From a paper:
The heterodinuclear Mn/Fe cofactor is found in the R2 subunits of subclass Ic ribonucleotide reductases (denoted as R2c) as well as a related group of proteins known as R2-like ligand-binding oxidases (R2lox).
Crystal structures were obtained of all three R2lox point mutants in the non-activated reduced and the oxidized resting state by soaking apo-protein crystals with MnII and FeII under anoxic or aerobic conditions, respectively. In contrast, the bulky isoleucine side chain in V72I-R2lox has a larger effect on Y162 than on the metal-coordinating residues. Aside from these two residues, however, the structures of V72I-R2lox are practically identical to the wild-type structures in both redox states. Judging from the crystal structures, it appears likely that the barrier for photoactivation is lowered due to steric hindrance caused by the bulky isoleucine sidechain, making coordination of Fe2 a more favorable position for Y162 than in the wild-type.
Author numbering:
A (entry chain A): 3 to 251, 263 to 286
B (entry chain B): 2 to 286
Write the structure that this text describes.
Amino acid sequence: HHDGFQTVKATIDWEHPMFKLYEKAKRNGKWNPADIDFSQDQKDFASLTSEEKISALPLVAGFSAGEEAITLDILPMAHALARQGRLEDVLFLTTFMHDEAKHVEMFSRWQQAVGIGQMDLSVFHNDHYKRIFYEALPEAMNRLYADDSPEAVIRAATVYNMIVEGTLAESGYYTFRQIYKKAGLFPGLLQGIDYLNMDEGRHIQFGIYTIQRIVNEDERYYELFIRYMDELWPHVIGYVDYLTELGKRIDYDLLRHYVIKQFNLRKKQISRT
Amino acid sequence: VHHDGFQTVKATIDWEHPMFKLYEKAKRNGKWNPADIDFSQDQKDFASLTSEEKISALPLVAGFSAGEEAITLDILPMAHALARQGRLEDVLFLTTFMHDEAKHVEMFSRWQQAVGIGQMDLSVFHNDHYKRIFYEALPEAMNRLYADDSPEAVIRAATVYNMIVEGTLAESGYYTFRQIYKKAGLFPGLLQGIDYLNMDEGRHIQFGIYTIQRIVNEDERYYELFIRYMDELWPHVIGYVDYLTELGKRQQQLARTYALEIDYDLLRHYVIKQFNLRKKQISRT
Ligand SMILES: CCCCCCCCCCCCCCCC(=O)O
Ligand SMILES: CCCCCCCCCCCCCCCC(=O)O
Ligand SMILES: [Fe+2]
Ligand SMILES: [Fe+2]
Ligand SMILES: [Fe+2]
Ligand SMILES: [Fe+2]
Ligand SMILES: [Mn+2]
Ligand SMILES: [Mn+2]
């Protein structure tokens, strides 16, 4: 039951950081994936050699699955914060969710346009990928229906924001750029990736805000945060090694260092105080 | 529980799904930002009213602010349930639904802030009937879906929120606010807000009808449930309406300072009109 309503008893906290992030999201979040011209992307893909055609697909499969996952899986988080009365958080998360829907849509549209929509790209998810996306992610998010303790929220934000978006996805945008914009290939996908990377700058900020406000109440949670990151590293780098083994069949030595860099950078964005 | 796989890895989005088409319309037609509305004439208009004129609109604003905030919290279980059923295109659409409702909450709260009543607690205009729908039945029917996503649970949730709250009360609210404050040349920024809001809600009702009718096509037993759930809520619908009516009648200072004939019997029949129209948008097959 609702006890009352903040915009009836009072107003929105206009000075809340997440309400300000909400405002930014409405201003900077107007792109529509339906407007992306994929026609050159189709030609590029067709002109590729089958050996080149596959080289693209592992990454797209990682992302298509990853965006769809978070679209389905943020909803428990939004619900738990709604139940705690954090209205400005909820306002922000509606932009988060619609961003992610556009992300799902964009990769799906590219798949469709280059002609691989009928292809099942699950074959490029290895065990380590499945551990993160098929298992740990939904596990940590769905927990929050029955357990919204600080430890549960921090574990979900760490998994979704610091590992999935902040290590794997950040590293993936960089990989796409380091490979295809140099080549002059796939300009519509790279356009989408650029819009998406803008969106994701906001998403990481909600995650930092969330993890940090909890850490602030008890620095015991800081060590929780680090432990959770390290728990998932073996699957992060297991996936990366799987993908680097594939491409060698571009210095994957560099992209495997960018992943390592991102992971440590994300750890540093949270302070013990 | 874990994901089996992902539709946009095995396949693609179902581009011909009607909820995808509705998602596409939502993106194209849902660009308005309440932060852009000019409330300066509203703040002056509100200040130009007496204490007694000043309140005639607040009961409506309190019903609206509470209603928009409730659904912002209470749609989330519905989106989760459909996500669990693999209804990806529904979920995509629902991201626009939820973001719309966020803007609706924001708009009324901006208006309250700008006209100067942010500090005033407007809960006093929620009578027991209002509470039974918005403080109780709405969240009960939605939160159910976390543990019971059966067709009958989904019908009930869509009926409460989409057919009653949006399609009866909110549709009547927009009419009332037009029949009164557009005729009074009052609160232009609020009515611009309400215009945009009402456009949003045309899509929301289409999702609710799609959802209810989808379930009724599986089995007609469910048509009767829809009618019964509509009927179980009518008394609170009309209980709130009578209450809002008796308020307006005894604070009639704004009606005659602005030479308006506010017909609280016409407004009452429009509510009844919306209720039955909503029944007619669901067919037994
Ligand atoms: C060979 C170098 C490795 C490059 C790393 C690529 C990893 C693929 C990206 C998958 C994660 C995408 C998750 C979406 C996050 C979000 O939607 O916020
Ligand atoms: C005297 C005339 C009575 C008219 C009825 C007025 C009722 C106020 C409506 C408040 C509910 C608003 C819910 C909005 C639903 C949505 O945002 O989708
Ligand atoms: Fe994201
Ligand atoms: Fe391994
Ligand atoms: Fe709505
Ligand atoms: Fe009563
Ligand atoms: Mn994303
Ligand atoms: Mn609304």
